[model samples]
Target: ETPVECFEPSMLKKKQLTVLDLHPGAGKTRRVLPEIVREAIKTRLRTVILAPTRVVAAEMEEALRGLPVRYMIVDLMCHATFTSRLLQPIRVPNYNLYIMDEAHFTDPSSIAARGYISTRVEMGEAAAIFMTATPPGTRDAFPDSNSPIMDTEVEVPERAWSSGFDWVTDHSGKTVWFVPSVRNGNEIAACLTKAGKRVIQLSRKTFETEFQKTKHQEWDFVVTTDISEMGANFKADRVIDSRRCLKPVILDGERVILAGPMPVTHASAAQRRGRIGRNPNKPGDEYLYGGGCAETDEDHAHWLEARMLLDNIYLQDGLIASLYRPEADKVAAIEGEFKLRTEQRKTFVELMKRGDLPVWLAYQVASAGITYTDRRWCFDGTTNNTIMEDSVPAEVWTRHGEKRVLKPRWMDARVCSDHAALKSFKEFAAGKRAAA
Candidate 1:
């Protein structure tokens, strides 16, 4: 029943670089990768496996247990640790082969992508493999590379979202609800808990403690974001996906841009669905919630605006290759939009150069069209003009004045929770929330 038997290991041996575009549930990690690792070990090749996240790296390490292979597993996000080793000239060629799992998640503009590309250039003849179910918009990472896309021809079992909660209540086994953010997951978990179902919300903060709870089957439901989508094996009977596949645009007379939840990519959706049905003895079902066109033309326009902005940021460096190729008109359209936002783009770049603003906060401020006032940020809503007095920590401003900038712990907190806080602030300023 494993894909290792049917896969030709020799094909991987022949290519200097290859792409294994296998569908989900095809055992890309468990079955196929082990065989390739075993062959590399037998030939005395030192291998390095790169995972997109720590959880995935841990899972891969567990899967490759019992092998006397001289291979190392490193998460892409641990750029400092990995880069330190690469900095040592003698260690550059220590690895003969490089394998990047879930390669699609590697943003082209990220430091991790730059490191990977640098390694490829340094070790010209190193064997490399990029494995993913959903590749990005471009695929020219290696021009002279072989790409073998194998379609398993297995249809995904899916249901509508309307009945997802009802189905969860009717079912007996465990369920994993995939949401867009920790805040969203918390909201859903509260609702599920209110319904008398044992539910646990998993996030970066709660993962360490909450993950152990899932292992003992103490909860009927686990509400989580995309953190659990890649390589974390949760043998659930059903999956409820409430992730919006496209960025949502909200318009109320004027464009109301709030730093909101992240749009789920098609690749992420596939991974979420694959979470279930891991146990072949008990096939599972998936409930898909959101994927449709924008309701109004204005809404669609704003969606495209946000999409182009985000795409421009991610595609700035062009280190990693993508599978998607936008049409000529589409390219022209993005460029046209880029020109119109020249001032905003310039300001964003200046913010980066100054290194005063947190990258995450800068992106939100730019995308949300927040204006910089006399040392304060302002969001001009239709009804009220909300000034972000505490957008950046007071220490950032004080340090900037002192000519010595220091990134505070709040910078990390801003990435996950500040947007919600900002949204709450906006609502309160507009009298949307009752006074405490």
Candidate 2:
């Protein structure tokens, strides 16, 4: 769907602003980082990596310990605080190359933007690779839906963790049994131990001790609820669902797998799937209990809604791709103090002209008392047939050059039908109009 090519040694050698749009399980951190760092070492450039969490940073350090570079991995928050917050900034170590693990967090909006300053200074001699399995833009592909799209049912006796373990063992390799809660996690850990597998239950301090305590043994099973706390380039031979997690809901009759009361989005599912499947030669099996992992539009929409709040904030950002021309220009003029490019100006303008935005955007500008030079400003115009009827009004009908225009002062006939609703509308509109 895009003209972008895969990452190549030539591109890395040239220090290109390379972007790789790969999904989870595609080995972005595990497979991609090693290759790039190897190349950087060959060129005799000191490679540095920045990660989102301490666990992930520690894992990256462990994974790359065999390499020649002196690795100093820091948690993203700690590093950002050191560089960005204090009056006197702590400096990042000088290095020839820098890698942003989970680089999706490297955008301007993130506080850790300053964490890359040391890397930026060395850009001339270094190359950078941004590694993240799931990027924010992937959220755009998901469909929008008002309905729940997936159902959640409470677990029963038949679906116990012991039986679930045997069902999961069908597909080989290191497996993780994802549960819904810490209570469930403990219960499930007991099952894994009863089944004679060494299981590690992820706790607050689990990461601090687990790997070193176990001598970095590849765990046969890790049963837990929290994925955020544990970090590093974690991949598995398989991932099994003990908890009723995200499974696609739409299917033929009896087959639809209800995602969960423990809801996960498509991105989360992909991240889970990525845990397996990195090595083509290995089994790379992924299995879901209660069977509703269908890839459908309804499921996609469910995924979208999982991150609905987060996505809404981004939509409010300057990421709306287009604006009606007049509204675009109005914003461009109002925001003239900032030097924004044509596309950026459009985005900047739309960002400022926000209220019941993408709905009342142009009307807000018109209401601001700056006349549109063309007398036609975005989405609303006589020709565009865009209508904003007075929600609560006293109609002030006016004739502008024989074309009749109704300017509002009060509500129309519907409020006439409902006296109480009309009165509420009047009070609400008065407060709203007074604020305006």
Candidate 3:
């Protein structure tokens, strides 16, 4: 895997006619983009840069503007031929360049809703040179695998993790935090706003129209659900990942964004952390908020891996593992190639160190609270404070026309005994985050 830094003066100096600047995460991409853009002009190549969305494309434009370049001009024209002739590798072409912004839109199924991959591919290469942060489908550079013309980006493992979560950035430039369950999501947003933070909660219900109201300023942070992932030209100073479906790598440390999802495995965690720190010019901050919703009972918290042991007794053993053999086998086959698992140890040695998956289960338990824990377990040992025995209103059933009312009765309802004993849970994960 070639590191991001590998793409440099030498790569462009050649007449390879194609180049792939492989940057691992947001930070690395930002760091490398300036050079790529600058060198594109030096070589007199109309650099065409494409990404996954408008916001990402805007990030490219904004990044270019921040850096000193020979081109010294930017035009937002699609490849309309007449538009290209007026702009790139031709007369009045201030900079030999074309940027599709988000290349993923090339997918015919995408919102761009244009043509198929071939049409988008033609559109991408429409300019003198093509550039994209997120590649469409898979291939980094066309033609050959080890083609020196195309650069491949590789990220170091450790630099990706802890560094991603340490900083808290401003979401002023480009950002979106979506919550699908809008009501519950905004209720959380309300708490954030009341705390003097300028947070925008976006919901389908809030907008009278099927679109978001654009504000030049005043609002710094905007919230939405999975629907808001793609499109839009936002160069946010920060981005927070509060949604589940968001591919964590989409915005981590890109444009000062912090994004990590409700993920299950360490590999996912590492990938989520990968895009956090590519640009040294812009110090990045990325955080993964885990275990925000923990409701499961801890006592009965036998891990799925642990419970699998009973499978041999109850039914065919290791069938679950066998079921995943197709996928797991492929993963295991490529694990070494991808360095997915770095350590190689004997089963005896691993056993001596204790179970790895169970520890993760425990950490996840402490990180996010889940079902049954808050209601069932919170009442085990409590007194007058519980809803069952305390002062709370309830509805009563009338069987024989006798007037009855709802009340907090110990025997009638499940009492949350720790009501009075429970302290206020005020956790502000965002310290430096707020609206402009």
Candidate with the greatest lDDT versus the true structure: 1
**What TM-scores do the predictions have?**
0.57, 0.44, 0.32
Candidate 2 residues 83-126, lDDT tens each? 22221223344444555655444212122232233224334444
lDDT tens per residue, model 1, 34-95? 88777777776666676655566666677777875333432233222343343222344445
341-428, model 3: which lDDT tens digit per residue? Answer: 1122122112112221121222222223322122222223234323322344322223333333322111211111122111110000
Root-mean-square deviation of each candidate, in angstroms?
10.8, 16.9, 20.5
Question: Model 3: runs farther than 4 Å from truth?
Answer: 1-5, 8-31, 42-47, 51-187, 194-197, 202-243, 246-286, 290-436
RMSD of 3: 20.5
Residue 388, model 1: Cα distance from true site in angstroms: 6.1
Candidates sorted on lDDT, descending: 1, 2, 3
Q: List per-prediction Cα lDDT, in the order shown.
A: 0.48, 0.40, 0.30
- For model 2, the superposed segments whose C-alpha errors exceed 4 Å read 1-5, 8-17, 22-27, 38-47, 52-68, 73-88, 93-97, 104-128, 139-174, 180-183, 194-197, 212-220, 226-237, 242-262, 289-436
Give, for candidate 3, the lowest lDDT window spanning 10 residues: 421-430
